[PDB]
Amino acid sequence: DYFNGIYGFATGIKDIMGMIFKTDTGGSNLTLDEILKNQNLLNDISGKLDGINGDLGDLIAQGNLNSELAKELLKISNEQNQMLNHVNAQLNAINSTLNIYLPKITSMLNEVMKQNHVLSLQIEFLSKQLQEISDKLDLNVLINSTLTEITPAYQRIKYVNEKFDELTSTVLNELTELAKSVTKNDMDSFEFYLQTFHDVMTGNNLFGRSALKTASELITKENVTTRGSEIGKVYNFL
Amino acid sequence: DYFNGIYGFATGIKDIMGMIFKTDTGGNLTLDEILKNQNLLNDISGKLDGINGDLGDLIAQGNLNSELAKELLKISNEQNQMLNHVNAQLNAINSTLNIYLPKITSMLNEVMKQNHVLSLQIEFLSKQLQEISDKLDNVLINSTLTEITPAYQRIKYVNEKFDELTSTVEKNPKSYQDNVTKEVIENLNELTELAKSVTKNDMDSFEFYLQTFHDVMTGNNLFGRSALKTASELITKENVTTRGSEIGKVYNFLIVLTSLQAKAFLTLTACRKLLGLTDIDYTQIMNHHIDGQKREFRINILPTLSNNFSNPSYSKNRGSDIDDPIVVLEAAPGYALIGFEILNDPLPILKGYQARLKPNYQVDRESMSETIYGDIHKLFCPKQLEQKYYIKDIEFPEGYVITKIVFEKRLNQLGYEVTANFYDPSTGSIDLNKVKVESSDEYSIIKAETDGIYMPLGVVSETFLTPIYGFGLTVDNAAITLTGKSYLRESLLETDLLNNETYLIASPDGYISSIVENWNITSDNTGSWRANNNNAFVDKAGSSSLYTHKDGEFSQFILKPKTNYVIQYVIKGRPAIYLKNNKDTLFEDTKNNFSDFQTVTKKFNV
Amino acid sequence: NDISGKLDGINGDLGDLIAQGNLNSELAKELLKISNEQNQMLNHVNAQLNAINSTLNIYLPKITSMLNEVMK
Structure with missing residues (x-):
C-alpha cells in the first residue's frame, strides 16, 4: 500500500484519540476507583x-409483647426499611452505571486495538529496513552519551x-493496573518519560545535543553500506 | 522593566516560602477521602x-422484658458501629471542605500569583539562552553532564x-462543596499525589536530586569540576557567536540554574504544607546553596571571562563608492550609550540605544530612548572600489562611559572618533566637563566583490544593557566587526554578587518606543486610541490586542514632512491599516491574511 | 487483649443494668451514651486485635511453611 508519512501516522492516531474522547460511558461525576470503592461501601x-x-423483624413477629410498644418497634422497622430502600437506590445506580461502562469500554478498547493494527502495518516495512543498518554497524563518546541519555x-x-x-488483544485488572501506573502523578511519571524523550529528540537538554543530530552522525559514518541515501536512512529513524 | 538579580529572585522565593510557612492547616487526613460522597454519607x-x-429512647424508657432489652441493645450496637464508621468518613470530608480547603486554596492561590511575578522577571532568558544552544556543538565536560x-x-x-497544577486547581473553596466536578477534584488529587512523591523519603528523593544539583554546581564532586566551570568552557570556545560577552552568557547560565533550585525549594515547601508534615524552613539552606554558586562564579570563573561583545551575525550588502557619509551617535547631556543593533529588514539600518545611568553602571529604565540611522550600507560597504578601514581598539580608563561615536567615510576611507565622559558609580552622575576623546596609520582594506561585503548584523550590546568603556572596528572573509567593552563585571560585583539591590535591563529584542501613543495594548483602556462602535474592542489574547469586526475601527491622531518612517505592527487575521490625510493615503496595508500573529515591517515617506 | x-x-x-429497666429515663439515656463511647473504643480495639490474631493464627502458619519450602 502507500505509506502516508509522519503527518499521516500522527493524524491516524489523533483520529483514534478523538474516537476514545467521544465514547460516552456512564457520565458519573466520579472516577472508576470512586465507583468500585462506593460500590463496596454501599454493598456492605x-x-x-x-x-x-x-x-428486628423476627423480634416483632415473636409477638407476646405490648400493643403500644409493638407499634413503636414497627415505626422503627419502617424507618429501617426506608433506609435500606434508599441505600439500595444508590447501589442500583452504581451497579447500572458499571453495567453501562464496561460494555462502552470493552468495545472502545477493541476498536482501538483494530485501528492501531492498521497504523502499525503502514510502518511494519521499516523494522526490517532499520535492522539492515544495525547489522552493518561497528564508536564516539557523543554517540554513547545520547544512548545513556535516551x-x-x-x-x-x-x-x-x-x-x-x-493486554487489549486479550479482553481487565492487568489493564486497569497498567492504566493506574501510566496516569499516576509522581516525579517519575509516564508523562515525565514522554516529555524527556522529546527534550532529548530536539536537544532542549542544557547542552543542546539532539539525538537526531547524534543518530545522523552514526548513519553518515561512511562505513554504512546499506540501501538508500543518508536522507532516507535518517528519515527512517525519524 | 527591571530584572532584580539572583538576590532579587531568591528573596522573592523566601517571601513566598514565609507566606506558606505561616499558613495554618490545624487538624487528620489521608487525602484519599471521596469528597463527592459528602451528600451520600450525610444522608x-x-x-x-x-x-x-x-430505638435508644425505647430502651431507656424501661417497661421492657430483660431478654428483649438485650436483643434491642445488640441491634443498637450493630447500628452504632455502622453510624460511627460512616461519621468517620463524613467528618474527614467535612473538615477537608471546611478547615483545610479554605486555608489551602488561598495559600496555593497566593503562591501561583507571587510565582507568576517571579517567572516574568526571568522570562527574557529562556529565549536568550536558547540563542546559545542553537549555536553549540573533555572528560571533565562529559563528567558534569552525566553528574547533572x-x-x-x-x-x-x-x-x-x-x-x-497550582495555577489550575480551583481556588474558590465554595466550588469544592456540594456540586464539585470530576475536573475540580482531579486537579486537587493530581496535586496531592505529586506532593506525596516530592516529599517521600527514599533513595530517589527530590531533596537528594536538589542536593546533588548544588554539589555539581560548585564542584563538590570528587574531581572538583563545577558545572559553572564547564559551562564557562563551552561558551568561551564558541566558533560562531551570540549577543553579549562571555560574562553575560555565563551569568545568564548562572541565573537559570539558581532560579531552578530556588523554585525547587519553594515547590518542596509547598508540597510539605499540602501533606501537613512538620514545617522545614528551607530558606537558610536555599540561600547558603545559591550563595555558594555566586561565590564560585565570582571567585573562580568570572575573572577569566571577557567583557567584549560583538555583532553576532553578518550580512552581504553593497554600499556607495561615491558617498562621503557622516553618522553620529550622540547621547544627550545626562545620558550614556548603552548599545546598538544593525538590521536590514526595512533597509540597512543602525539603531542606537541611549539612557541615563543609575549607580554601578546600571541603567534608568524610564529614561531610555532609541534612534534609527538609515543606509548604513553606504557607510560600512563600498560597491566597486576598495574601501580602507582605519582600525584602532579605542579604550578609556575605568569610570569613563562612551557618550558619542562618530563615523566618517571620505573617498572610501572609513574612520571613527569616540568621546567618553567621567561617571561616578556611587551617585551615577556623568561629569560633562571631564571628557576624553580618541580616534583612528594602521588600517585594513577590503576589495569590493560584485556580490557585496559582509557588514555587521544583529544586536551589538551586553546581555544586560550596560554603559561601555571600549569600542573598535575589526576587519577580516571580507567581514567587518563592531566590538565594545561592557561594565557588566563592575556592575555585578557591587550589586548582585554582594546581595545588594540590582537593577538590570535585558537587551531588547526589537523596538522599545513608537511615535504612536499606547502602541502596546495591555488593559481595556486604549488611551489615545479611540473606538467608534461596539464592533471595535480589546481582545485578551494573553497579551491583549485591538479587535475589529464588520465596520469597527480604531483611530489615533498624529510626523515631519518629506521624511522616511518605519511602520511595524504585529497582526492576525485580515486587517486594513491606513495612514490617511482625509484626502491622500500616505500608507495602506490590506490584502494581508494570517492564521496567527506575525510582525510586518515596512517603510513609508510632501 | 487486656x-x-x-x-x-x-x-x-453496664449493658445488663440498662436492660434490667427500673431506671430513671433521663439517666438511662446518659448511661447509653456512655455505652456507645465505650463500645466505639472496644470496637476500634477489637479491630486491631482481630488483625493481630488472624496474622498469628491463619496467615503466619500458611506463610512460614510456604517460605520454608521455597527456601528448601
Whole structure:
C-alpha cells in the first residue's frame, strides 16, 4: 500500500484519540476507583442493614409483647426499611452505571486495538529496513552519551506501548493496573518519560545535543553500506 | 522593566516560602477521602442517627422484658458501629471542605500569583539562552553532564508540573462543596499525589536530586569540576557567536540554574504544607546553596571571562563608492550609550540605544530612548572600489562611559572618533566637563566583490544593557566587526554578587518606543486610541490586542514632512491599516491574511 | 487483649443494668451514651486485635511453611 508519512501516522492516531474522547460511558461525576470503592461501601451497609432489619423483624413477629410498644418497634422497622430502600437506590445506580461502562469500554478498547493494527502495518516495512543498518554497524563518546541519555525513556515507552497492545488483544485488572501506573502523578511519571524523550529528540537538554543530530552522525559514518541515501536512512529513524 | 538579580529572585522565593510557612492547616487526613460522597454519607448518617435515636429512647424508657432489652441493645450496637464508621468518613470530608480547603486554596492561590511575578522577571532568558544552544556543538565536560542531567531533568519536570497544577486547581473553596466536578477534584488529587512523591523519603528523593544539583554546581564532586566551570568552557570556545560577552552568557547560565533550585525549594515547601508534615524552613539552606554558586562564579570563573561583545551575525550588502557619509551617535547631556543593533529588514539600518545611568553602571529604565540611522550600507560597504578601514581598539580608563561615536567615510576611507565622559558609580552622575576623546596609520582594506561585503548584523550590546568603556572596528572573509567593552563585571560585583539591590535591563529584542501613543495594548483602556462602535474592542489574547469586526475601527491622531518612517505592527487575521490625510493615503496595508500573529515591517515617506 | 478483656466486661455489666429497666429515663439515656463511647473504643480495639490474631493464627502458619519450602 502507500505509506502516508509522519503527518499521516500522527493524524491516524489523533483520529483514534478523538474516537476514545467521544465514547460516552456512564457520565458519573466520579472516577472508576470512586465507583468500585462506593460500590463496596454501599454493598456492605446494605448487607448489614438487611441482617439488622432481619433480627428486628423476627423480634416483632415473636409477638407476646405490648400493643403500644409493638407499634413503636414497627415505626422503627419502617424507618429501617426506608433506609435500606434508599441505600439500595444508590447501589442500583452504581451497579447500572458499571453495567453501562464496561460494555462502552470493552468495545472502545477493541476498536482501538483494530485501528492501531492498521497504523502499525503502514510502518511494519521499516523494522526490517532499520535492522539492515544495525547489522552493518561497528564508536564516539557523543554517540554513547545520547544512548545513556535516551534508553531510560525509550525502554519504558516501548514497554508500556507493547504491554498495552498485548493486554487489549486479550479482553481487565492487568489493564486497569497498567492504566493506574501510566496516569499516576509522581516525579517519575509516564508523562515525565514522554516529555524527556522529546527534550532529548530536539536537544532542549542544557547542552543542546539532539539525538537526531547524534543518530545522523552514526548513519553518515561512511562505513554504512546499506540501501538508500543518508536522507532516507535518517528519515527512517525519524 | 527591571530584572532584580539572583538576590532579587531568591528573596522573592523566601517571601513566598514565609507566606506558606505561616499558613495554618490545624487538624487528620489521608487525602484519599471521596469528597463527592459528602451528600451520600450525610444522608445515611442523618437516617441511621434518628433510628438509633428512637430505638435508644425505647430502651431507656424501661417497661421492657430483660431478654428483649438485650436483643434491642445488640441491634443498637450493630447500628452504632455502622453510624460511627460512616461519621468517620463524613467528618474527614467535612473538615477537608471546611478547615483545610479554605486555608489551602488561598495559600496555593497566593503562591501561583507571587510565582507568576517571579517567572516574568526571568522570562527574557529562556529565549536568550536558547540563542546559545542553537549555536553549540573533555572528560571533565562529559563528567558534569552525566553528574547533572538526572537531577536537572527531575527538578525541571517537578517544578513545571507543580506550577501547571497550582495555577489550575480551583481556588474558590465554595466550588469544592456540594456540586464539585470530576475536573475540580482531579486537579486537587493530581496535586496531592505529586506532593506525596516530592516529599517521600527514599533513595530517589527530590531533596537528594536538589542536593546533588548544588554539589555539581560548585564542584563538590570528587574531581572538583563545577558545572559553572564547564559551562564557562563551552561558551568561551564558541566558533560562531551570540549577543553579549562571555560574562553575560555565563551569568545568564548562572541565573537559570539558581532560579531552578530556588523554585525547587519553594515547590518542596509547598508540597510539605499540602501533606501537613512538620514545617522545614528551607530558606537558610536555599540561600547558603545559591550563595555558594555566586561565590564560585565570582571567585573562580568570572575573572577569566571577557567583557567584549560583538555583532553576532553578518550580512552581504553593497554600499556607495561615491558617498562621503557622516553618522553620529550622540547621547544627550545626562545620558550614556548603552548599545546598538544593525538590521536590514526595512533597509540597512543602525539603531542606537541611549539612557541615563543609575549607580554601578546600571541603567534608568524610564529614561531610555532609541534612534534609527538609515543606509548604513553606504557607510560600512563600498560597491566597486576598495574601501580602507582605519582600525584602532579605542579604550578609556575605568569610570569613563562612551557618550558619542562618530563615523566618517571620505573617498572610501572609513574612520571613527569616540568621546567618553567621567561617571561616578556611587551617585551615577556623568561629569560633562571631564571628557576624553580618541580616534583612528594602521588600517585594513577590503576589495569590493560584485556580490557585496559582509557588514555587521544583529544586536551589538551586553546581555544586560550596560554603559561601555571600549569600542573598535575589526576587519577580516571580507567581514567587518563592531566590538565594545561592557561594565557588566563592575556592575555585578557591587550589586548582585554582594546581595545588594540590582537593577538590570535585558537587551531588547526589537523596538522599545513608537511615535504612536499606547502602541502596546495591555488593559481595556486604549488611551489615545479611540473606538467608534461596539464592533471595535480589546481582545485578551494573553497579551491583549485591538479587535475589529464588520465596520469597527480604531483611530489615533498624529510626523515631519518629506521624511522616511518605519511602520511595524504585529497582526492576525485580515486587517486594513491606513495612514490617511482625509484626502491622500500616505500608507495602506490590506490584502494581508494570517492564521496567527506575525510582525510586518515596512517603510513609508510632501 | 487486656484492654479488650476489661472494656468488654464493663460494657457487659453496664449493658445488663440498662436492660434490667427500673431506671430513671433521663439517666438511662446518659448511661447509653456512655455505652456507645465505650463500645466505639472496644470496637476500634477489637479491630486491631482481630488483625493481630488472624496474622498469628491463619496467615503466619500458611506463610512460614510456604517460605520454608521455597527456601528448601
